[PDB]
Design a protein around this nucleic acid. Structure first.
Lengths: 177, 97
RNA sequence: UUUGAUGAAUAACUUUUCGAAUCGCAUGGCCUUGUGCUGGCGAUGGUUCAUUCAAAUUUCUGCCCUAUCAACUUUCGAUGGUAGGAUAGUGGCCUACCAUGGUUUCAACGGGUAACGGGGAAUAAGGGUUCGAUUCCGGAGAGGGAGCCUGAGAAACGGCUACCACAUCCAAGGAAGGGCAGGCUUACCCAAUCCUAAUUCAGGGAGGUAGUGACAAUAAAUAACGAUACAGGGCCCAUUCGGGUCUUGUAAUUGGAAUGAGUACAAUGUAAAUACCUUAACGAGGAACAAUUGGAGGGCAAGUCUGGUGCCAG
RNA sequence: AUACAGUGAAACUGCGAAUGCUCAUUAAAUCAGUUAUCGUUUAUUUGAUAGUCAUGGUAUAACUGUGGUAA
């Protein structure tokens, strides 16, 4: 599997919680929520077993350093909060923050989360160098400062799109005829 | 406008058979995959060479555009070019039948 | 006594094997100008030995359960000797002539072993808990017993005899052949690699590419933004009175902007080719470029049907 | 080119053609390892290697033609 059904999938709490999440982040599935929460469960389970491993054990030492530093390179963790109880303290909304369509809306290139969804799938937003078009990119730090419009996108770039040019030619024909 | 860029990366030489060796990337923004014949002639002036003796091949274009992966050669004599090339490449270059 | 040196064919025998009656080029030198002599640099063969590719046996080292397995071998020599045949070669491999042995609780032997088994055999698991990928399985068969034939290497089984069993074709005299896929698709090329031949090329249904084949398990889209109008009501909880709260509601009009599914020239592609990656040009306003599946609940008639103590209930 | 020399079918001859699927289960057997071959064989590879008739006879295939038989 890559998505796991939560063990009491239809509950008052579960259900209204997913309502809030998908409405606020502009998702379209329980499946998207589940993918994030499943991989968070694996991470946090790893951290807990690491806490079972006692203090100053070499395994705990080295691997805890590894897990903290790679989560801060992913960016969900913050620079001055380097401890395994904080990797225990994470939750789903932090990853759902780090998605891409939320990040376009938060930076301000669009107005609503659904606008950002349509932009990214419309192939206008270009992290870094390529045109990314998958609205769950999980942008890192370096790129989350580098998100912007694609150079061939008619919002931040070349000639206007096909509706605009058929329209300008249509008023050109209006003046001609 | 178009920076006609084929980087002839992986630059090495072989003077036994007298031919020079180099890989291909194709960096060519707002251009659609420049063709090997105009590449042949362009390589001919840059290496002061023969229109047959230039020989590049096998190009695959990278994402983000203006980048293609291929694999290129040049002979350094007309006899070497006309004898040592396999005939499928000879007809790809339109020198055989 | 040391420093240093040397060693430690005959007799015949036989189907003769041989000591090239074969391809590529020197043109000279000399006089006997005959075209005389002489000659050099490249291929195919042959004598033997070495070496190489192989092959044969062979030393020893290692693999399960079980004594509810104590016997086993001479009943194809079982153990050994001597001699000979046989083999490319030793050796009871085989025969004479003999001796009478060997294995064994340190369990021989025997039984079961699911022995699709195991081998660090195999690359490994660039962090799945032990897991992947490769390689050796071991033998036999190529209608069925039997026998023979070449070649360096075959006991070739897509040679031959006879046999037995099949099954054919015909003018009835004769003749000749060998299962494999499928259920309860058999399209291109020797191009990447390697191989084989008198060998650049020839060839290699080796080796490769492509096409039919939702299954499980992935990532998206089916719309985003704004303006105007018109209305006064919405919504949440309580068992009945009730209570709580507040920008809201409508198949109402309307504006431009975005594009991907598509549609469609090329280039990039490979033996060649499909797809692909790219790429100009078109290409979204609802009866569209027309998504399903499931659940709960009303209301309606000059309508139908049944039961009733009017007009009602089902 | 008045022998031919280009090219070439049929054939002689040289070499390869000994690198195919199906069916049956063994615990020193196999397999893996390690020997030995002063005890054997080897087409091929490479390396050496033989002082002991101005040219002898054949034959075929093919071809020609004639036939047989349902074949």
């Amino acid at each position: 599997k890559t998505y796991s059904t939560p063990k009491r999938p239809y509950e008052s709490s579960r259900l209204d919680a997913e309502l809030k999440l998908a409405g606020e982040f502009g998702l379209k599935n329980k499946k998207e929520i589940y993918r994030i929460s499943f991989q968070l469960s694996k991470i946090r389970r790893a951290a807990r077993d690491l806490l079972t491993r006692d203090e100053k054990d070499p395994k705990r030492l080295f691997e805890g350093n590894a897990l903290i530093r790679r989560l801060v390179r992913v960016g969900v963790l913050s620079e001055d909060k380097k401890k395994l109880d904080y990797v225990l303290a994470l939750k789903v909304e932090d990853f759902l923050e780090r998605r891409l369509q939320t990040q376009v809306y938060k930076l301000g290139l669009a107005k609503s989360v659904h606008h950002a969804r349509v932009l990214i799938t419309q192939r206008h937003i270009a992290v870094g160098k390529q045109i990314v078009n998958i609205p769950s990119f999980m942008v890192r730090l370096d790129s989350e400062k580098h998100i912007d419009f694609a150079p061939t996108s008619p919002f931040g770039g070349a000639r206007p799109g096909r509706v605009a040019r058929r329209n300008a030619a249509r008023k050109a024909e209006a003046s001609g005829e | 406008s178009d920076a006609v860029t084929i980087r002839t990366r992986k630059v090495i030489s072989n003077p036994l058979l007298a031919r020079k060796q180099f890989v291909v990337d194709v960096l060519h923004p707002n251009r659609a995959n420049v063709s090997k014949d105009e590449l042949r002639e362009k390589l001919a002036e840059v290496y002061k060479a023969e229109k047959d003796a230039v020989s590049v091949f096998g190009f695959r274009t990278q994402f983000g555009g203006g980048k293609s992966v291929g694999f290129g050669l040049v002979y350094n004599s007309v006899a070497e070019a006309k004898k040592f090339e396999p005939t499928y490449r000879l007809v790809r270059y339109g020198l055989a039948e």
